[PDB]
Design a protein around this nucleic acid. Structure first.
Ligand code: ZN
Length: 54
DNA sequence: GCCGAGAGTAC
DNA sequence: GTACTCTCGGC
């Protein structure tokens, strides 16, 4: 079928090896404070490079 | 409307 | 043994 990563099923333990590996992140354009670095990238495409490229 | 975090895998 | 990516839900 498919596989929507549903966090609804029980037994969802929160190991820190998921949030600890990530470290605070700031945007050097609008100083937006993004916690996870992976999200920082997404912030670039939404609040800056979100313009149609060429 | 954007943001914050969970899971599975590979080397 | 760790960090990686994609995905979902919330105020
Ligand atoms: Zn920014």
């Amino acid at each position: 079928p498919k596989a929507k990563r549903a966090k609804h099923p029980p037994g969802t333990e929160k190991p820190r090896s998921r949030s600890q590996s990530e470290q605070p992140a700031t945007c050097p354009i609008c100083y937006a404070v993004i916690r996870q670095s992976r999200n920082l990238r997404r912030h670039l495409e939404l609040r800056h490079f979100a313009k149609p490229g060429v």
